[PDB]
């Protein structure tokens, strides 16, 4: 162990190495173009395979931070490029490192990548495959210096097999752009997850993190014992701490080792795991974080007898709170892959707060006694709330059941842009879409994953250009309680109903011509603004209206001379949806 560019590069394998190489340096260097990138990648190559033939070569025995951060010193635009940036080249290597992340600029000045024409992108995967590839890699990781940069790796492999695939096929556009959809969202959400998990950590506390991932993890490795799953949540504790600082190797040191020792230890953690455990270094540690939840163990009694029954349950819990409270989670988790982590969560938070009064009170067992009970009226919001939205899923579709969605929440918050009121009533549709396929007992989880997603960027949008107090409470208590809270907010009582305004509802023919998913925006986009205008109509009046539009579209798109058309019975429907309301 001499040598940790050599040690990596026949960790990685050279294709591997060499992609790796291109991301950091788009990371840190965004402004510099791909070619000036590509040529610090082969010169950082050679130097490579020099150390892997003889590992007492010069400069072979440095810091792999130490051999990165020279190679961002070279460069001779830095300071007329990134300016401060080029003063931390003049410090020595601990401070220089930390000096290099703070200059790293998350959400930077770039413009939006256009996704080409489909044979525009398949005769250029087709002419030079490695560097169409390789361009997009180094665009998409210097807009999102903090994305890993392994999974950056594995979204690009997963393109190459769609163009693979889609490029020989009859219909191109037909086979690719679902996969190019799905994978554009994907790599969204991900982003997204991150910044969510990071700012778990930073402003709520360690402690919540530990948290969430007690509950996580003993859902997925139920036979686990208590200890094996604190160990592998203070491992994950510094995995992620170190992660959301943004220092690219010691992160992936630290998941590296967490993979290699759960896949020795798999006896004491899951079955599920010989699959992620035959796979190489660079895919372990991402394999591990997806699998499927492991079988519980069919033995399992209640929990009453250690956390409600005992004695020794006051004196337990003032011991350790926290492991006790820990050892409640993890107890109940394991027990309910059915629910969502913040459900559980919920249950844990509930359990503390009647420990803490009733640990202090006369009789304790007596105070406590009935504390399960408290736990129902909250898990049967939650499911309830997925039951209902299922069946109303089911009986309008996917498009119709983001109309009924984009009415709820207009009515609820009517402050909100309509953009944004159209954007996550689609979102949230799309969401009934995939989370209702699953039985009932994965719909929870399922449900979760996408929400609190859609409710942090939600809140952090709302942050910048604020718009309403209670949206704001809802953001700023508790995380736990985010979507609970979005779920109780009621009709707006206080709202001016915005005033009419002629354009708003005025139609041409150009709607015709739209793709479905245009057109529906576009409709959606009318739906808003005439719950903004008439906020208190029923859902039979917008159902008179609505239909009533639907017949306008189609009588005006079925005639001859289209536009002469939408601005007379234009004129009708106006006055006689004015009318109604
Ligand atoms: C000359 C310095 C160049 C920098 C070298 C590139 C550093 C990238 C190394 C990444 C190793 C990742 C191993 C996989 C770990 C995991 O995610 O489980
Ligand atoms: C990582 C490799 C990316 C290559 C895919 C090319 C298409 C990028 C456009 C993104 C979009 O779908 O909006
Ligand atoms: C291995 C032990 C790790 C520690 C686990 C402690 C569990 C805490 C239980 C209370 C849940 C609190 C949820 C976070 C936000 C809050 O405090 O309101
Ligand atoms: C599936 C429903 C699709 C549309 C989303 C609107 C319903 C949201 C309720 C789901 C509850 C979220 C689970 C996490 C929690 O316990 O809060
Ligand atoms: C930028 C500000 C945006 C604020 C968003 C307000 C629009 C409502 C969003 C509700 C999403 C959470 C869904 C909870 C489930 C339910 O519908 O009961
Ligand atoms: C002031 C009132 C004026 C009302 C004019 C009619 C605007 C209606 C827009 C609703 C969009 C309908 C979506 C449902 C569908 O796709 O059929």
């Not at 010069?58 to 007329?80: I, M, P, Q, W, Y």
């Not at 210096?145 to 690009?156: G, S, V």
């Not at 337990?316 to 629910?339: C, I, Q, S, T």
Request: proline residues 4%; contains cysteine; aromatic residues 8%.
């Amino acid at each position: 162990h001499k040598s940790e560019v050599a040690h990596r590069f026949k960790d990685l394998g050279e294709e591997n190495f060499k992609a790796l190489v291109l991301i950091a340096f788009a990371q840190y260097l965004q402004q510099c173009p791909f070619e000036d990138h590509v040529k610090l990648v082969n010169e950082v190559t050679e130097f490579a395979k020099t150390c892997v033939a003889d590992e007492s070569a010069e400069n072979c025995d440095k810091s792999l931070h130490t051999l990165f951060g020279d190679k961002l010193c070279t460069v001779a635009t830095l300071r007329e490029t990134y300016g401060e940036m080029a003063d931390c080249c003049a410090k020595q290597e601990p401070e220089r490192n930390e000096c290099f992340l703070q200059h790293k600029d998350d959400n930077p000045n770039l413009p939006r990548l256009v996704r080409p024409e489909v044979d525009v992108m398949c005769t250029a995967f087709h002419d030079n495959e490695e560097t169409f590839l390789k361009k997009y890699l180094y665009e998409i990781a210097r807009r999102h210096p903090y994305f890993y940069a392994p999974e950056l790796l594995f979204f690009a492999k997963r393109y190459k097999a769609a163009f693979t695939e889609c490029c020989q096929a009859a219909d191109k556009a037909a086979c690719l752009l679902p996969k190019l959809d799905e994978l554009r969202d994907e790599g969204k959400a991900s982003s997204a997850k991150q910044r969510l998990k990071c700012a778990s950590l930073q402003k709520f506390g360690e402690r919540a993190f530990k948290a969430w991932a007690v509950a996580r993890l003993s859902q997925r490795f139920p036979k686990a014992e208590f200890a094996e799953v604190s160990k592998l949540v203070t491992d994950l504790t510094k995995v992620h701490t170190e992660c959301c600082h943004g220092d690219l190797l010691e992160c992936a040191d630290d998941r590296a080792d967490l993979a290699k020792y759960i896949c020795e230890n798999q006896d004491s953690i899951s079955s599920k795991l010989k699959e992620c455990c035959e796979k190489p270094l660079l895919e372990k540690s991402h394999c591990i974080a997806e699998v499927e939840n492991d079988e519980m163990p069919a033995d399992l009694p209640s929990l009453a007898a250690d956390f409600v029954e005992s004695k020794d349950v006051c004196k337990n819990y003032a011991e350790a709170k926290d492991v006790f409270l820990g050892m409640f989670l993890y107890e109940y988790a394991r027990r309910h892959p059915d629910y969502s982590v913040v459900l559980l969560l919920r249950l844990a938070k509930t359990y503390e707060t009647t420990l803490e009064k009733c640990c202090a009170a006369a009789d304790p067992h007596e105070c406590y006694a009935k504390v399960f009970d408290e736990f129902k009226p909250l898990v049967e919001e939650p499911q309830n709330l997925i039951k209902q939205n299922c069946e109303l899923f089911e009986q309008l579709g996917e498009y119709k059941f983001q109309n009924a969605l984009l009415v709820r929440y207009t009515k609820k918050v009517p402050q909100v842009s309509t953009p944004t009121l159209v954007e996550v009533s689609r979102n949230l549709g799309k969401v009934g879409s995939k989370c209702c396929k699953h039985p009932e007992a994965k719909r929870m989880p399922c449900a979760e994953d996408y929400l609190s997603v859609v409710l942090n960027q939600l809140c952090v949008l709302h942050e910048k250009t604020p718009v309403s107090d209670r949206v704001t409470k809802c953001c700023t208590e508790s995380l736990v309680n985010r979507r609970p809270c979005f779920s109780a907010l009621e009709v707006d009582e206080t709202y001016v109903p915005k005033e009419f305004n002629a354009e708003t509802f005025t139609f041409h023919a150009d709607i015709c011509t739209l793709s479905e998913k245009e057109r529906q925006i576009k409709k959606q986009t009318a739906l808003v603004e005439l719950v903004k205008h008439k906020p208190k109509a029923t859902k039979e009046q917008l159902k008179a209206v609505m239909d009533d539009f639907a017949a306008f579209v189609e009588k005006c798109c079925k005639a001859d001379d289209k536009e002469t058309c939408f601005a007379e019975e234009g004129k009708k429907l106006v006055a006689a949806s004015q009318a109604a309301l």
